[PDB]
Design an enzyme around this catalytic site. Sequence first.
Site, PDB file in Angstrom:
ATOM      1  NE  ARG C 141      -3.928   0.359   0.552  1.00 60.62           N
ATOM      2  CZ  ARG C 141      -3.764   1.480  -0.150  1.00 60.62           C
ATOM      3  NH1 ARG C 141      -2.901   1.525  -1.157  1.00 60.62           N
ATOM      4  NH2 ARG C 141      -4.465   2.561   0.154  1.00 60.62           N
ATOM      5  CE  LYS C 177     -10.859  -2.970   0.546  1.00 58.88           C
ATOM      6  NZ  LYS C 177     -12.010  -3.208   1.464  1.00 58.88           N
TER       7      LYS C 177
END
Lengths: 329, 189, 189
Positions: C141, C177
Amino acid sequence: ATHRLLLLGAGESGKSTIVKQMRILHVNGEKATKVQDIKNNLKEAIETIVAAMSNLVPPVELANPENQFRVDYILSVMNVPDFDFPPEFYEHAKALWEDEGVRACYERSNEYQLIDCAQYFLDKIDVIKQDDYVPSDQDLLRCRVLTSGIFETKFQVDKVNFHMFDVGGQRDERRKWIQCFNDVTAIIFVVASSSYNMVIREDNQTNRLQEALNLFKSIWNNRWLRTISVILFLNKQDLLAEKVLAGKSKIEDYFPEFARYTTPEDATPEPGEDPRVTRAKYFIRDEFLRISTASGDGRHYCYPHFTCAVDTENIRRVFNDCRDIIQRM
Amino acid sequence: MMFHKIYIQKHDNVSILFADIEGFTSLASQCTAQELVMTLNELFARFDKLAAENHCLRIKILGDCYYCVSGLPEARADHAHCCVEMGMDMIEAISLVREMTGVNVNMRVGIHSGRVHCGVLGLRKWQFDVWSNDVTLANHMEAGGKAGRIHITKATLSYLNGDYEVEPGCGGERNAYLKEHSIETFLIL
Amino acid sequence: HQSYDCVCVMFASIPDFKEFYTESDVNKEGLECLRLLNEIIADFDDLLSKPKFSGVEKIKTIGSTYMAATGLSAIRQYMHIGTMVEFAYALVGKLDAINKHSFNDFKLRVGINHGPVIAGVIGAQKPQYDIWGNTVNVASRMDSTGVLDKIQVTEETSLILQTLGYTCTCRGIINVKGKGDLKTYFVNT
Ligand SMILES: Nc1nc2c(ncn2[C@@H]2O[C@H](COP(=O)(O)OP(=O)(O)OP(O)(O)=S)[C@@H](O)[C@H]2O)c(=O)[nH]1
Ligand SMILES: C=C[C@@]1(C)CC(=O)[C@]2(O)[C@@]3(C)[C@@H](O)CCC(C)(C)[C@@H]3[C@H](O)[C@H](OC(C)=O)[C@@]2(C)O1
Ligand SMILES: [Ca+2]
Ligand SMILES: [Cl-]
Ligand SMILES: [Mg+2]
């Protein structure tokens, strides 16, 4: 026996023109489509000249103040999208081109981006304007259009096959070249030898020939092109001759090493060619040869040619030398 | 000599299946790093078993993402029929190891058919892989898919020979790449 | 498969490759592009043979993203973290070199994290070596939300880098997330 040839060089070097000559020479509604493009060439060429007159230093003046109204007419229509080309355009265009000031600005064209086919089309407006106009072979050769992408032109000479690949010379376009580096017979590297007095388009600062030189060193010394030999097409010799004999812009005032340069003993000047041009044309060659000489190590070679892409009487002759050299690869 | 040798070959009439886990992140929070990785490996072992019978060559496991083209290493006439039945199996496979884990999760399957290049890149740690716009589409089909459902293209239907009970997929509604490339998508029953 | 404590994981993508990839006929329907990716990935695979990077272990290539880790050859303390950074500066040099010969302007986008992983083989048919755990998810990420020419690290990873002579700058907040909002930092030169 097939041969895949990549054409390389800066922007507006000759690449497209040469592909065209292969079609003239070694290939066979089709031209009505190209008429529009020539007219655009004419349009973009006249505006560019007048537009530039007032932005130059010193600024240039029209010899006939009457023409100011056509100057106004041209700039008014400069941006128009699907331009109609009414017979006024040609009238006003011609009139301007007759104005010695418009021409005097055109001499100083090394100071702004003006296409090569300007003076050619501006000398023949009355022919192009007729609605029954059909472009001559030289007209099609001269029509300038930008190449975006890669175009494969296949032809044959004496049952021997050739695949020719055309690429964009503009910086943004050079990123596509790599795609043609594997399985390639030979590089044809085109140079606008005459562009020694003018800067490039992409930054409007970097000298065109110096750009060409750096581009050659990039290719000559490329990691994926140590095997592959390069046929050097030093091109625009007519335009080169013009400038040297015209004596307006000296070469040494752009490439100071020229002052410290005498003509090669191995030089073979074309029948009755001026010693000055001779000196000049071979000096541009040697500038390129220094790059090729430096590295290489007998794995690839440099074969120069003096070339005029718009002269089929010189293309056949030099392309013949290239068929010859292709014997070992 | 001057370019490294590329271990890559072109292959048409193949069918690409991407499969992702819906709500994998919810599971990832419910159990320890240990259990997750064990449950993952226990599932993809089953997937690999199902793959070989359904004639699909498994390509790579990317975290929670599984892909396995059919039509390799040598062409197959039912290359798209495989994937459909292969995808069918994954929905059942996951279901068994879904309610036994506690939290409900599901497989989201997307499929496409076309040409691909395949093989290996670089020099070190070779893993067999696939590349093409058709693979790029394949991956987006999974992205723009529905849980427990199998998303297929117009192409992966021009190969199905009308053997499965289809229905409009609306892939433009779930994925921009699909919409902007104007792809007609469907779902199966 | 066994677990680990302090493993430094890194992703390096070339997001500007996806645009470059075209499928024509001149370029053999996308092969001539892969030929370049190869030349690059192979240059990236070649670095591992350097003595200074002997502790670097390439895990996989994902699409056109290079994934590598340090501290897998375990049983200063965080010497390997600062070696991973040293390594990412190196890929930028290979890429810069390719760019010269490829008349291109490829930039690299790096995310780097450290923490516990799990390492081991996966899949029945073709067992392949991969490393799981949140540490990697975050690393992933911080590539995808990265910036070109920049290395993007987490807070504690930045902490280490400072205790090794590296200067840093805060990006602000990223939403990962399943792990929520969190403060990230670019490394400076
Ligand atoms: N006078 C003269 N003009 C030439 C000569 N060679 C090319 N030209 C003209 O210069 C222009 C530029 O060359 P052209 O072939 O069109 O672009 P290019 O070199 O291929 O560059 P690009 O299209 O990739 S951006 C053409 O319009 C052509 O007519 C020449 O030898 N003498
Ligand atoms: C290598 C070129 C190109 C365009 C071709 C291709 O099919 C891909 O490799 C896939 C789709 C493809 O290889 C299947 C796996 C995965 C991971 C989904 C790839 C990435 O999305 C690549 O994008 C990235 C990040 O490079 C992508 C799209 O890149
Ligand atoms: Ca998921
Ligand atoms: Cl040039
Ligand atoms: Mg051209």
